[PDB]
Short mmCIF file of C-alpha atoms in Angstrom, two decimals:
data_model
loop_
_atom_site.label_atom_id
_atom_site.label_comp_id
_atom_site.label_asym_id
_atom_site.label_seq_id
_atom_site.Cartn_x
_atom_site.Cartn_y
_atom_site.Cartn_z
CA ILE A 1 -46.73 4.74 -0.64
CA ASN A 2 -50.06 3.02 -1.24
CA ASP A 3 -49.30 2.58 -4.94
CA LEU A 4 -45.91 1.16 -3.95
CA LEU A 5 -47.67 -1.30 -1.64
CA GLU A 6 -50.06 -2.34 -4.41
CA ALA A 7 -47.12 -2.96 -6.75
CA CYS A 8 -45.38 -4.95 -4.02
CA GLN A 9 -48.46 -7.12 -3.47
CA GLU A 10 -48.88 -7.70 -7.21
CA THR A 11 -45.21 -8.58 -7.70
CA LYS A 12 -44.08 -12.19 -7.32
CA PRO A 13 -40.52 -13.54 -7.31
CA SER A 14 -39.10 -13.88 -10.81
CA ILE A 15 -37.45 -17.05 -9.47
CA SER A 16 -39.55 -19.81 -7.96
CA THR A 17 -38.13 -21.18 -4.72
CA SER A 18 -37.24 -24.45 -6.45
CA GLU A 19 -34.83 -22.72 -8.84
CA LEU A 20 -33.60 -20.43 -6.06
CA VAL A 21 -32.51 -23.34 -3.86
CA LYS A 22 -31.23 -25.37 -6.82
CA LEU A 23 -29.01 -22.54 -8.06
CA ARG A 24 -27.90 -21.72 -4.51
CA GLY A 25 -26.77 -25.31 -4.01
CA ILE A 26 -25.06 -25.45 -7.41
CA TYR A 27 -23.23 -22.17 -6.81
CA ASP A 28 -22.18 -23.11 -3.28
CA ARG A 29 -20.86 -26.46 -4.49
CA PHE A 30 -18.95 -24.68 -7.27
CA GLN A 31 -17.45 -22.18 -4.83
CA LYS A 32 -16.38 -25.02 -2.53
CA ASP A 33 -14.99 -27.02 -5.46
CA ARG A 34 -12.95 -23.98 -6.46
CA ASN A 35 -11.87 -23.86 -2.81
CA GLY A 36 -10.66 -27.44 -3.32
CA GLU A 37 -11.91 -28.84 -0.01
CA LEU B 1 8.81 -18.87 -0.30
CA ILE B 2 9.29 -22.04 1.75
CA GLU B 3 6.38 -21.02 3.98
CA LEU B 4 4.14 -20.63 0.93
CA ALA B 5 5.28 -24.04 -0.30
CA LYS B 6 4.34 -25.44 3.11
CA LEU B 7 0.85 -23.92 3.12
CA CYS B 8 -0.15 -24.86 -0.43
CA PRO B 9 -1.90 -28.25 -0.69
CA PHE B 10 -1.02 -30.69 -3.48
CA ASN B 11 -3.76 -29.52 -5.86
CA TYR B 12 -2.05 -26.31 -7.01
CA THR B 13 -0.83 -25.96 -10.59
CA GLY B 14 1.45 -23.55 -12.40
CA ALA B 15 -1.63 -21.55 -13.34
CA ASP B 16 -2.65 -21.44 -9.67
CA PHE B 17 0.78 -20.21 -8.55
CA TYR B 18 0.82 -17.62 -11.34
CA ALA B 19 -2.62 -16.39 -10.27
CA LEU B 20 -1.52 -16.23 -6.62
CA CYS B 21 1.60 -14.21 -7.45
CA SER B 22 -0.46 -11.94 -9.70
CA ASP B 23 -2.92 -11.27 -6.87
CA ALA B 24 -0.07 -10.55 -4.45
CA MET B 25 1.50 -8.11 -6.91
CA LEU B 26 -1.92 -6.53 -7.43
CA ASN B 27 -2.27 -6.03 -3.68
CA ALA B 28 1.17 -4.42 -3.47
CA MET B 29 0.16 -2.23 -6.41
CA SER B 30 -3.08 -1.31 -4.65
CA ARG B 31 -0.94 -0.19 -1.72
CA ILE B 32 1.28 1.88 -4.01
CA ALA B 33 -1.64 3.40 -5.93
CA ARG B 34 -3.42 4.35 -2.72
CA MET B 35 -0.25 5.96 -1.40
CA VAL B 36 0.15 7.98 -4.60
CA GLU B 37 -3.51 8.97 -4.32
CA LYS B 38 -2.87 10.24 -0.79
CA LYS B 39 0.21 12.08 -2.08
CA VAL B 40 -1.85 13.86 -4.73
CA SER B 41 -4.81 14.59 -2.45
CA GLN B 42 -2.73 15.96 0.43
CA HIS B 43 -0.58 18.03 -1.92
CA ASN B 44 -3.77 19.47 -3.43
CA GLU B 45 -4.28 21.20 -0.06
CA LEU B 46 -0.75 21.80 1.25
CA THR B 47 0.30 23.68 -1.89
CA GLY B 48 -3.27 24.32 -3.02
CA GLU B 49 -2.30 22.84 -6.40
CA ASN B 50 -4.93 20.32 -7.52
CA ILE B 51 -2.39 18.53 -9.70
CA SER B 52 -4.32 15.49 -10.91
CA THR B 53 -2.65 12.09 -10.64
CA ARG B 54 -1.89 12.41 -14.35
CA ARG B 55 0.74 15.11 -13.86
CA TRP B 56 2.20 13.03 -11.03
CA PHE B 57 2.48 10.02 -13.33
CA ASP B 58 4.25 12.16 -15.94
CA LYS B 59 6.56 14.21 -13.68
CA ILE B 60 6.19 13.50 -9.94
CA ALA B 61 5.78 9.70 -10.01
CA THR B 62 9.46 9.07 -9.31
CA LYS B 63 11.15 5.73 -9.92
CA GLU B 64 10.66 4.54 -6.34
CA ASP B 65 6.92 5.21 -6.56
CA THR B 66 6.94 3.32 -9.85
CA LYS B 67 9.08 0.67 -8.16
CA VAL B 68 6.96 -2.30 -7.08
CA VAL B 69 7.61 -3.72 -3.60
CA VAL B 70 5.67 -6.68 -2.18
CA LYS B 71 5.35 -8.16 1.30
CA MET B 72 4.72 -11.67 2.61
CA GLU B 73 1.27 -10.64 3.85
CA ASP B 74 0.18 -9.97 0.26
CA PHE B 75 0.85 -13.54 -0.87
CA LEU B 76 -0.55 -14.95 2.37
CA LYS B 77 -3.80 -12.98 2.09
CA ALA B 78 -4.17 -13.99 -1.56
CA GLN B 79 -3.56 -17.59 -0.47
CA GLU B 80 -6.41 -17.31 2.03
CA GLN B 81 -8.47 -15.82 -0.80
CA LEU B 82 -6.96 -18.37 -3.19
CA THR B 83 -9.27 -21.08 -4.50
CA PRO B 84 -7.96 -23.93 -6.70
CA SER B 85 -9.33 -24.09 -10.23
CA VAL B 86 -10.09 -27.83 -10.29
CA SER B 87 -12.20 -30.21 -8.22
CA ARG B 88 -10.61 -33.05 -6.29
CA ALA B 89 -13.03 -35.21 -8.28
CA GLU B 90 -11.37 -34.08 -11.51
CA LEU B 91 -7.94 -34.67 -9.96
CA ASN B 92 -9.07 -38.21 -9.13
CA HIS B 93 -10.36 -38.66 -12.68
CA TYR B 94 -6.99 -37.63 -14.10
CA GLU B 95 -5.32 -39.93 -11.56
CA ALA B 96 -7.49 -42.74 -12.92
CA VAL B 97 -6.26 -41.85 -16.40
CA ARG B 98 -2.67 -41.87 -15.11
CA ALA B 99 -3.15 -45.27 -13.46
CA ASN B 100 -3.99 -46.99 -16.74
CA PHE B 101 -1.49 -44.91 -18.74
CA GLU B 102 1.50 -45.41 -16.40
CA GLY B 103 1.23 -48.71 -14.50
CA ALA B 104 1.38 -51.08 -17.47
#
């Protein structure tokens, strides 16, 4: 468990929040566009 | 069919209607496939004969089971799941094209 916690602390998101929110917005707009509303 | 015509907005295209009908048929087929699966599973116990769905498809999948029957709810549910394949912005762009190519 401790080694797992060390790995968790070391790990950082492969996606920076900027790209996360950008892609979320793009994908939501595409889903809505497909929904045609 | 008139109800479906009522529900559909004016952005649908022949591709959209084909996709909708395909999804409805797929839902009916999911119903049929599940019912055949229950047939096979239950018969595996009642007769104790674990006759895989293959043997049913070759010998016990009668014409009626092969027969495809669809219900309004299938098309309606697909319609709720349905999503047009073009943006109203693109429709307006093509309308702009039409305006110059049809009004003169």
